[PDB]
Design a protein around this ligand. Structure first.
Ligand code: HEM
Ligand code: HEM
Ligand SMILES: Cc1cc(N)nc(CCc2cccc([C@H](N)Cc3cc(C)cc(N)n3)c2)c1
Ligand SMILES: Cc1cc(N)nc(CCc2cccc([C@H](N)Cc3cc(C)cc(N)n3)c2)c1
Ligand SMILES: C[C@H](O)[C@H](O)[C@H]1CNc2nc(N)[nH]c(=O)c2N1
Ligand SMILES: C[C@H](O)[C@H](O)[C@H]1CNc2nc(N)[nH]c(=O)c2N1
Ligand SMILES: [Cl-]
Ligand SMILES: [Cl-]
Lengths: 362, 362
């Protein structure tokens, strides 16, 4: 069965890919070469062109993604050549540097050797390359709760965090053959952080909030024509709400609304006052203002939704069926102010794509 | 086929209804009586108890409804006896009076004779008993756009609106036998309206906004054990967001955000300013404050979601499967601040229930 699944996925993918690249005539010959190669090695290897475009197709088919308008400009880094943990480490270090680009963030994906027989060559433990640790012991809550299990896992392996609310977790990953993963402290010079300040409420700085510049997902598998790249970290820039409406606001995350309500000078006593709503808006204004002032890319949810509308229009013009997840595409603040809220979307899964995968710790 | 569908729905309904009312032993005898009656008349008649409880079951199974915690206290008015348009008119007039209750709104449903052979006995044209007209001619936009087609329909039948932004549409309905519906002007004394003011921005009154006190849906069919009550208007009280985040804010409705931005003294120029978000919160604060000051019932979206959580808990305790529509249950402002946003719901249709139906005009 396994051999056949790969072949079927490859026929579908190559034809679709070469079709877009104006290479429909090369499909016959390429499929042959692939069919012999699977017949031989139990698998096949993508050409650089097939890989770069499959990465892009995969972004375009991400139903939960509002920022898809720029799918075609994804910067793809082909690192299928790495064999050593120093090489993986440096590749990750580099991806951070190049994607950050001094604040002018470039959407980038680094692609490591794929699973062989389901066997991973490189196994990244990070959820994101850049993330804050989290600690909960003796009712004492420090940092990001979402990171608690990975934090303890690191501390099993001999890492120790300073236990501020913003400890950068180290990179942690395991190579095929090693029973344990390795960890490397992130160089502070590679990581941009943005202190949160409000455009005109000076007291807002007293909260001493901050967030990292670049969200770099490293826990999803890229599947491209039957080939499974379990290790392919990718990034864009942030939409302001992700920091202001979720990461800093959620009760299960940094839970800062009451404190925000205090510094913006309103009461947090009555539901009918809409204090949470109001704190939410000011905090999200703070996040947007702060990133802009630092010269770090970021998009507000109105602009993002405007962009996404162009993406729907563009898909219609190209004759491509559009797919999406309404429940993720709506922003968690003022959703009814975007066009997204008022239409619906077909949530079908089209390949290539990115798929969540089980993490080894817990 | 038709006879059989009714029977099947009735078996299911009676058993479930008598089960909850502690009347499981009466099910055998009642089902017999029903089976003979359908055998005879092509249909069957509900007992007052079956009707009141079916109305309540139907509210409880409304997936899109966040206010379901109070399903069991629904006030049911049995008006299956009406035969004349003066009687329907007075029944509607009364429902408005009793439900409004001087501002202390009582959740109420008035139930008119059901469809016979799919043949309606009473056909209500209103979307809601109380609603504002809408006019669009020569690029001139007046009132509520959502009401445009019903407004023209009324004006075909010889009604004429003053063309303010808040003309109360008349009641309009058609009796079986009549080719045309009749219309009756709503007595201003029956209708409570709330001028919108802000707790501390005095200029907010310059917008001269207002809204009606009681939302009374009159375009949905109540289906109870195979019997179809196409005419069964029902009401609760408003959740603040429905007025502030949708009715007054939507571009396709009253579209007031830019004007709100002006009176609250902020710029409506940059997306990154989150001016729409901020206008939204102040306008929703205004709506809550205004209804409270007038002594008219209303719930804010935080309290409503708190209530709805009790409803989920209550359903689990009673051994009832919970059903709901996540896309409607989340409020259109600060949804991620409610528990609803973070879980998911089974959107299955359970009967009894309320179903939308085609309107005769357009
Ligand atoms: C360039 C700017 C980008 C913006 C503003 C953007 C925006 C977003 C947002 C707001 C989400 C929802 C995240 C959440 O709620 O947790 C999201 C999810 C996602 N984005 Fe993007 N995105 C961008 C670039 C990218 C890139 C480069 C990729 C990959 C090639 C991508 C693929 C995805 C995927 C797969 C998800 C879903 C992740 C999951 O299922 O947990 N996006 N995006
Ligand atoms: C007592 C206070 C109540 C509150 C606060 C409440 C709240 C809401 C809200 C916010 C919606 C969404 C409306 C929209 O977005 O257009 C809704 C929908 C709905 N509610 Fe309620 N509700 C209440 C009472 C009732 C009652 C008495 C019934 C009927 C017995 C009911 C049945 C429904 C139904 C059927 C819908 C969906 C209508 C549709 O599909 O268009 N609710 N409710
Ligand atoms: C490229 C990119 C750009 C951008 N602006 N934002 C992002 C944020 C993506 C993201 C972040 C945190 C958590 C999750 C997801 N919530 C993590 C997750 C967990 C589980 C169990 C399943 C699943 N599908 N996902 C997804 C990505
Ligand atoms: C009892 C009650 C209490 C409360 N607080 N609010 C309400 C508001 C209900 C409502 C109002 C306007 C428009 C729609 C619906 N949007 C009207 C509609 C249209 C169509 C085509 C389908 C469909 N299912 N519905 C539904 C009701
Ligand atoms: C088509 C799309 O699902 C539509 O915008 C829905 C979304 N959820 C909603 N939720 C509520 N409460 N009211 C609505 O009218 C809608 N519209
Ligand atoms: C289970 C439920 O659908 C869940 O809360 C979803 C809702 N939509 C979301 N949308 C975004 N952007 N991010 C999320 O984490 C979620 N969570
Ligand atoms: Cl994030
Ligand atoms: Cl309404």
């Amino acid at each position: 069965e396994e051999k056949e699944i790969l072949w079927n996925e490859a026929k579908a993918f190559i034809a679709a890919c070469y079709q877009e690249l104006g290479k429909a005539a090369e499909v016959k010959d390429r499929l042959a070469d692939i069919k012999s190669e699977i017949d031989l090695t139990g698998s096949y290897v993508h050409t650089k062109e097939e890989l770069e475009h499959g990465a892009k197709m995969a972004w375009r088919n991400s139903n939960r993604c509002i920022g898809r308008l720029f799918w075609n400009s994804l910067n793809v880094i082909d690192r299928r050549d790495v064999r050593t943990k120093e090489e993986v480490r440096d590749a990750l270090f580099h991806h951070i540097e190049t994607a950050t680009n001094n604040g002018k963030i470039r959407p980038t994906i680094t692609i490591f050797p794929p699973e062989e027989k389901g066997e991973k060559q490189v196994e990244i433990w990070n959820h994101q390359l850049i993330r804050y640790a989290g600690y909960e012991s003796d009712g004492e809550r420090i940092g990001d709760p979402a990171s608690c299990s990975l934090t303890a896992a690191c501390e099993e392996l001999g890492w120790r965090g300073e236990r501020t609310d913003f400890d950068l977790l180290p990179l942690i990953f395991r190579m095929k053959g090693d029973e344990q993963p390795v960890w490397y402290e992130l160089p502070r010079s590679l990581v941009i952080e943005v202190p949160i300040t409000h455009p005109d409420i000076e007291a807002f700085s007293d909260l001493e909030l901050k967030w990292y510049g670049v969200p770099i997902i490293s826990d999803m598998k890229l599947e491209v024509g039957g080939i499974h790249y379990n290790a392919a970290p990718f990034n864009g820039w942030y939409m302001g709400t992700e920091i202001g409406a979720r990461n800093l606001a959620d009760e299960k995350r940094y839970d800062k609304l009451k404190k925000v309500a205090s510094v913006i000078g309103i009461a947090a006593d009555y539901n009918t006052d809409l204090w949470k709503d109001q704190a939410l808006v000011e905090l999200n204004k703070a996040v947007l203002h702060s990133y802009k002032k630092q010269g770090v890319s970021i998009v507000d949810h109105h602009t993002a939704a405007s962009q996404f509308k162009r993406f729907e229009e563009q898909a219609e013009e190209a004759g491509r069926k559009l797919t999406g997840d309404w429940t993720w595409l709506i922003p968690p603040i003022s959703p009814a102010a975007t066009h997204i809220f008022h239409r619906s979307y077909d949530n079908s899964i089209v390949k290539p794509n990115y798929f969540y995968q089980d993490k080894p710790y817990e």
